[PDB]
Amino acid sequence: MATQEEILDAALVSGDSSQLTDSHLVALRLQQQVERIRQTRTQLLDGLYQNLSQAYDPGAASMWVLPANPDNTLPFLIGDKGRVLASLSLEAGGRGLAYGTNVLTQLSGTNAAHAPLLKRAVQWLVNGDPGAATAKDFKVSVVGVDKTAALNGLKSAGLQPADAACNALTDASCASTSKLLVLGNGASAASLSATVRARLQAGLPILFVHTNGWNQSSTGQQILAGLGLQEGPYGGNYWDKDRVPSSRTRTRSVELGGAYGQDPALVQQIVDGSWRTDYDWSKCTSYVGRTTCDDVPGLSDFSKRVDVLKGALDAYNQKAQNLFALPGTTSLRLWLLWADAVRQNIRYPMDKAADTARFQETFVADAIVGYVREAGAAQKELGSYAGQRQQSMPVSGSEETLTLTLPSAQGFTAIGRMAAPGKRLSIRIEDAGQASLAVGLNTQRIGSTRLWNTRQYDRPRFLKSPDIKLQANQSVALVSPYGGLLQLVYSGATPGQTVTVKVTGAASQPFLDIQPGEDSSQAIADFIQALDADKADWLEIRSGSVEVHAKVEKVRGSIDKDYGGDVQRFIRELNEVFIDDAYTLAGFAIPNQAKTPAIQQECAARGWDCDSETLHKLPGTQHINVDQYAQCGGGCSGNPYDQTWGLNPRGWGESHELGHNLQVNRLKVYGGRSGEISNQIFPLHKDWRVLREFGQNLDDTRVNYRNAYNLIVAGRAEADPLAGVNKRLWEDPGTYALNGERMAFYTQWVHYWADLKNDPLQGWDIWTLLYLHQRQVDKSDWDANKAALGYGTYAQRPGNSGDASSTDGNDNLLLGLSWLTQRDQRPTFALWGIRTSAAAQAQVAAYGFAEQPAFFYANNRTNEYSTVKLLDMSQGSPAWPFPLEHHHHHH
């Protein structure tokens, strides 16, 4: 029925791009509109400038003042370095001008040359025409900046203003009689932004001067917002000292101001299809399978122009502003609808050489997504991100209420619902306390769109939305073209607080929400049933301080591969063998889980606090993304950390990487030298557990006892035996240097503790105890607790350096280990080439323990401790006591 022309016109009002498919049509309209704006700008600027001097130097002590909506705001003065030093506003049908410094008191000094242009700008403010004289004694209200100095400035520019002698900012009758309001940052008013806007809308011209030099100003920001302008970033003009030179021409300033925050060349390119056919892709590089193209000539400049558009639209997304409910946003509306229209046409996969036109146009459209609206369109093809299930997910007509717990002060947490593609969702938050909140969609890192890899432009570049700010008790309506996992983004929260999320129009992905310390068997059954229905492409799991955001087919693949399709057993292992294993090893205070009897008892014997939230609360969330692609490689560090293989509760990588989140500097030998070592206790512990509890032998050659021994025996023969071992074991700075040999130091203490306790099952408690000890060392009141912690001799809390040249880690390890074992461990530290400070050595001497003579635990397997052998290193070095497993040695 309706033509595309008709669909476009209605879409411009409503934001409803559902039926809009002709991108070329929208693009012609955008071209006309961008040309309207350039014509309107250039006539205004040309009228302002004429052949007057363009010289304007605001100095280092000044601020940049930027436009926002390109249809109604624009630069006035752009320096040679491209910084906007003053801007013009026609917002709300008004007239305003804003400068980054108080130019009015410089019109007889540094900026005498600017005075004639300033007079034309005032004529434009007062009369709407830069060549129309002001009346003699025209009434000017000056508020928030020195009145006499401002009025004298205007006089020295050849104007004849008279003091209005009333306040046109705060008094609406004064406004109606006044010809101009001049504002500075000393102003007082109720609802300053709205008040400025009201005056502007009513037809009072406004001239703002920034009065705080290179300092930012909240009052300044609020005035600018009322004008529809933007305070520049921190530091102002302090570094660049940008200025407009005397040599600047009318033509050039008209061109720069007409072009600012506009891209007619891009719009033409779109309209004509003139996408670049000859990028030199040979200049792309690849790194562990990911191709990037930063050095392809021309490409960065193009990508940065597309970033401008993305940044301009995302500024509205972030503040929860609906462009279609804001008057005079036509250019931006047209960009948004153009990109929605492209999205009806996208087809995957694309390749950077084979499909230059579709690839480049998509590259642009993907950058332009308006989330805050009452209606919109789904992208037709979701490629490697999702498919028909995501597209068809049902949504709730009624409002659902969700209670979320924030585990730390800052981060994000899964809400447990999705936006469905093209479907309006409404959301709000209540009972936030002092937490600052936003909503976001999806968790993908941008490297997981592999668009520069051959034929892998197969999903949107920006699956994760901007963070959309929320206010207590105010609803926001969203439509996403992709659908997505809703996240609650938070800062300034109180660990353990809750937030109430009310949402209407959301879909319900399979979501497993383990309730801390409560029975979960119903939640699991409900999750399994949701998976069985197979109505989603994405699922989430929240289990303790871990949240998993996962493509269903990837998780299904892991369950099918390693669990024979048994979703229950997979979940149990994920919760227990993976997650709980790690958090319990690190000794955190886990709801409704007591410490084991041996840990309980040792904590009482040491008289320690091993249970308070104050000291041992669970840390903030570690997120895991499971997807077809990762930020880097086939999996990548971070938070979230990314992986593409699935999700393996028994995996080495999963626990190694979780282990990074749980590292602490005071348990690292030589700082960064243990940056890939001290986290290894997590996967090692898990493998020890897996071999015992399941009979499966994983990664059984990780701990290189044999070569650690070789290096120790060779090193200790040197004149300085500690330095000799240090050189051989800890000196190499390579990321995974001597990884297996350094790990063997960490396990020494496990075998020692098992022997000391006379219980082969207790060995790993030493690491849980050191963790407990360290968090007290880190946060307990020093004078009151140092004796219990074995730090009696220290006037102050030790340092927390992670540097390889620091002894902070070595020292605390030496003290914790000596104190817990109740033996002086200096001789085994020396054996391993590990130096400690004089302070720490004195503390160990203070304990008055018997030395533990140097010792070394040797094994020819990592996971099976029953064969470990204890070597006395105190008088010499015995021969390595093992053959190699399943090996034929030389006769």
Q: Name the minimum Å distance from CB 656 to Zn ion.
A: 6
Q: Name the minimum Å distance from CB 712 to Zn ion.
A: 25
Cβ closest to Zn ion, residue 115 vs residue 681:
681
Enter the tokens of residue 620: 């903030």
- Contact between 112 and 197 under an 8 Å Cβ cutoff? The reply is no
Q: Name the minimum Å distance from CB 264 to Zn ion.
A: 48
Enter the tokens of residue 116: 């004639």
Cβ closest to Zn ion, residue 735 vs residue 866:
735
Alpha-carbon span 642 to 289, nearest angstrom? 15
| Residue carrying structure tokens 């299904």 | 556
Check residue 620 and report its DSSP letter.
Answer: S
Alpha-carbon span 853 to 857, nearest angstrom? 13
- Contact between 381 and 349 under an 8 Å Cβ cutoff? The reply is no
- What is the distance in angstroms between the CA of the first residue and the CA of the last residue of the chain? 90
Cβ closest to Zn ion, residue 239 vs residue 736:
736
What number of CA atoms fall less than 13 Å from residue 868's CA on the CB side?
Answer: 23
Q: Name the minimum Å distance from CB 35 to Zn ion.
A: 54
Q: Name the minimum Å distance from CB 744 to Zn ion.
A: 18
Q: Using CB atoms within 10 A of its CB, is residue 668 exposed (0-12), middle (13-18) or buried (19+)?
A: buried
Cβ closest to Zn ion, residue 582 vs residue 844:
582
Alpha-carbon span 93 to 106, nearest angstrom? 30
Cβ closest to Zn ion, residue 676 vs residue 699:
676
Cβ closest to Zn ion, residue 231 vs residue 687:
687
Instruction: Give me the residues that bind Zn ion (CB under 5 A), please.
Output: 676
Give every CB contact of residue 302 below 8 A, 6+ residues apart in sequence. Answer: 276
- Contact between 175 and 149 under an 8 Å Cβ cutoff? The reply is no
Q: Which residue is nearest to Zn ion (CB)?
A: 676
Cβ closest to Zn ion, residue 99 vs residue 730:
730
Check residue 493 and report its DSSP letter.
Answer: P
Q: Is 89 helix (H, G, I), strand (E, B) or coil?
A: strand
Neighbours of 562 (CB within 10 A): 16
- Known binding residue 888? Answer is no
Alpha-carbon span 656 to 684, nearest angstrom? 9
Enter the tokens of residue 578: 């993976």
Alpha-carbon span 532 to 526, nearest angstrom? 10
Q: Name the minimum Å distance from CB 676 to Zn ion.
A: 5
CA angle 162, 166, 168 (to 5 degrees): 95
DSSP secondary structure letters along 709-728: HHHHHHHTTSSSHHHHHHHH
- Contact between 625 and 640 under an 8 Å Cβ cutoff? The reply is yes
Q: Name the minimum Å distance from CB 674 to Zn ion.
A: 11
- Spell out where the chain is interrupted, by the residue before each break (C to N > 2.5 A): none
Chain-centre distance for alpha carbon 258: 34
Cβ closest to Zn ion, residue 676 vs residue 811:
676
- Known binding residue 685? Answer is no
Chain-centre distance for alpha carbon 514: 26
* Residues pairing with 547 in the sheet: 542, 623
> Which helix (H) or strand (E) element contains residue 318?
helix 299-318
- Contact between 185 and 211 under an 8 Å Cβ cutoff? The reply is yes
Cβ closest to Zn ion, residue 243 vs residue 656:
656
Alpha-carbon span 634 to 639, nearest angstrom? 16
Q: Name the minimum Å distance from CB 632 to Zn ion.
A: 13
Check residue 412 and report its DSSP letter.
Answer: E
Enter the tokens of residue 706: 């044999």
Cβ closest to Zn ion, residue 642 vs residue 676:
676
- Contact between 162 and 155 under an 8 Å Cβ cutoff? The reply is no
Verify whether residue 657 is a known catalytic residue: yes
Q: Name the minimum Å distance from CB 660 to Zn ion.
A: 6
C-alpha distances out from residue 281 to 147, 293, 450, 459, Å: 61, 7, 15, 20
The strand pair at 468-469 and 538-543 is best described as: unpaired
Q: Using CB atoms within 10 A of its CB, is residue 240 exposed (0-12), middle (13-18) or buried (19+)?
A: middle
Q: Name the minimum Å distance from CB 730 to Zn ion.
A: 17
Q: Name the minimum Å distance from CB 546 to Zn ion.
A: 17
Q: Which one of the listed residues 657, 718, 864, 885 is annotated catalytic? A: 657
Q: Using CB atoms within 10 A of its CB, is residue 863 exposed (0-12), middle (13-18) or buried (19+)?
A: buried
| Residue carrying structure tokens 């040197």 | 718
Cβ closest to Zn ion, residue 547 vs residue 676:
676
Catalytic residues: 657
Annotated binding site for Zn(2+): 656, 660
Annotated binding site: 656, 660
